[PDB]
Design a binder for this molecule. Structure first.
Ligand SMILES: *[C@@H]1O[C@H](CO)[C@@H](O)[C@H](O)[C@H]1NC(C)=O
Lengths: 100, 440
């Protein structure tokens, strides 16, 4: 049977009822490696780690993709004025930031 | 002075609170509900027990005919069977081979054991609440059976306590209940005069000693066997005994919130639902001025041991240099920890130990003492026992169980991505400004 923090009681035959309450003793270690942390906070608080971890990963991926997109756009906008010069002289930008 | 507090209605768990005044020493109030009762008002609809089919001795008329007397007894039926030839131990009863009649008559009564083995069908409504509180205010301790209706005060030593009303109107008993053998069942019994054969309430009496009886058992008379003196009959089997065969577990086994169902009177005890609002009117006599009470100075809190277990799994040691000996209403205004002791003895100089229960892996709270507000921090560890036999004394906060490592990881994932976005935005703005200024 599953016993939660709310409680759980059973009566076995003519014995008096016995009540039990759970405690937070999940497998894993929160003060450890990421896999142990995920195991501890998934055995505890389920559907609060799967949702939270997925949201965090999605936000991180969106942030990384957006940062890459702005960096590429900035590189294009800083190089094309110098890039499409017929003789293609680009000393200054490469010297100040090494974009290429 | 007036106070309005609210405490959980969990029996057997003490609840501590502190009262603070602008120019008076803080005072501790401890309330311990030993037993919380819920007593609905019940009306005895009727009483049902095993029935007994009583048959009058057959009226045998030799060489003649009889008539059916009018029906007056419960479920009573009378029938005249013609062409009978009864026999007795002496011999043939009638001398006519035919045209003899036998009147058979049957009815239903309560069993002889209805005074003891009977089930009472009640209608339950209008639940009331009663709390047996140990109340300790101003080092004054009493026990009271306070009614949790909002209207009624309880008075002691000039203090007025107005408990109630209960937060939740939920009750385990439904509208129609059945009492049998000291157990309560939620049964939708038929109304009086509406019982059905072979089911509960097939015979109904208003009271265990009542002179009335409604019977409905499909009693029908059969033809007597040839050469026999008896009254055959056919009935649906007793509805009471069938109900006992298919009772289902009582309310003491199927009630929510851990309620314990009792009888005489019909009560539900120790239901872990709702909250009791308490209204306190405390006279100023118990209050003591700040000068009278000891004043704390140079106090430091150390968590020499902490496990976030259900019970008081933490000890805090506070080093104090007080002005004088006395009593301190030690309390944590925050919900991080729950204190076993609502008051602590205080000396001129030394260390005081306080037992507290917390659900936080990394606790940090503001322990309030006579006047000081010490900041106590530390680390707690998971307990040994997977399962215990007592409810949790503390309370669980949303961020209670998040460790420092988890916090750092979350900040790196959420807080480092924002840094990368800011860096990209700054780079884009710089590039745009540079190219725009270099056009002209
Ligand atoms: C409450 O008061 C009763 C009556 O003195 C006592 O028996 C009981 O132990 C008290 N409960 C607690 C928790 O002290």
């Amino acid at each position: 049977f599953t016993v939660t923090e709310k409680g759980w009681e059973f009566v076995w035959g003519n014995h008096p009822p016995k009540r039990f309450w759970a405690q937070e003793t999940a497998p894993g270690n929160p003060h450890g490696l990421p896999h142990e942390v995920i195991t501890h906070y998934y055995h505890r608080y389920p559907m609060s780690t799967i949702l939270g971890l997925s949201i965090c990963a999605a936000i991180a991926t969106v942030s990384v993709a957006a940062s890459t997109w702005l960096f590429c756009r900035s590189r294009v906008a800083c190089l094309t004025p110098y890039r499409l010069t017929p003789n293609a002289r680009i000393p200054f930008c490469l010297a100040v930031l090494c974009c290429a | 002075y007036e106070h309005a507090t609210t405490m959980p209605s969990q029996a057997g768990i003490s609840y501590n609170t502190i009262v603070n005044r602008a120019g008076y020493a803080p005072l501790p109030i401890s309330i311990t509900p030993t037993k919380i009762k819920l007593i609905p008002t019940v009306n005895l609809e009727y009483v049902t027990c095993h029935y007994k089919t009583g048959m009058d001795s057959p009226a045998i008329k030799c060489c003649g005919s009889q008539e059916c007397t009018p029906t007056y007894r419960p479920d009573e039926q009378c029938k005249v069977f013609t062409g009978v030839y009864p026999f007795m131990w002496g011999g043939a009863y009638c001398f006519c081979d035919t045209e003899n009649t036998q009147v058979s008559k049957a009815y239903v009564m309560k069993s002889d054991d209805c005074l003891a083995d009977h089930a009472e069908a009640y209608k339950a409504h209008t639940a009331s609440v009663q709390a047996f509180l140990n109340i300790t205010v101003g080092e004054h301790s009493i026990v009271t059976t306070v009614y949790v209706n909002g209207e009624t005060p309880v008075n002691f030593n000039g203090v007025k306590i107005t408990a109630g009303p209960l937060s939740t109107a939920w009750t385990p008993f439904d509208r129609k209940i059945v009492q049998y053998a000291g157990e309560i069942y939620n049964y939708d019994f038929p109304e009086y005069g509406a019982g059905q054969p072979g089911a509960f309430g097939d015979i109904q009496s208003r009271t265990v000693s009542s002179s009335d009886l409604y019977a409905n058992t499909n009693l029908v008379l059969q033809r007597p066997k040839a050469g026999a003196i008896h009254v055959p009959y056919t009935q649906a089997p007793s509805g009471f005994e069938q109900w006992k065969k298919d009772k289902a577990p009582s309310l003491k086994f199927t009630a929510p919130f851990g309620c314990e169902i009792y009888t005489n009177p019909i009560r539900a005890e120790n239901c872990a639902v709702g909250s009791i609002p308490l209204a306190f009117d405390i006279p100023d006599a118990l209050f003591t001025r700040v000068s009278e009470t000891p004043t704390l100075s140079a106090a430091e809190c150390t968590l020499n041991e902490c496990v976030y277990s259900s019970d008081f799994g933490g000890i805090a040691t506070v080093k104090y240099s007080a002005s004088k000996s006395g009593k301190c209403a030690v309390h944590v205004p925050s919900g991080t920890a729950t204190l076993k002791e609502a008051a602590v003895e205080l000396t001129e100089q030394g260390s005081a130990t306080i037992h507290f229960s917390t659900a936080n892996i990394h606790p940090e709270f503001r322990l309030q003492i006579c006047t000081s507000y010490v900041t106590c921090k530390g680390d707690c560890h998971p307990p040994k026992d997977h399962i215990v036999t007592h409810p949790q004394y503390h309370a669980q906060t949303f961020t209670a169980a998040v460790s420092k490592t988890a916090w750092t990881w979350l900040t790196s994932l959420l807080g480092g991505s924002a840094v990368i976005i800011i860096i990209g935005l700054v780079l884009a703005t710089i590039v745009a400004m540079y190219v725009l200024t270099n056009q002209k």
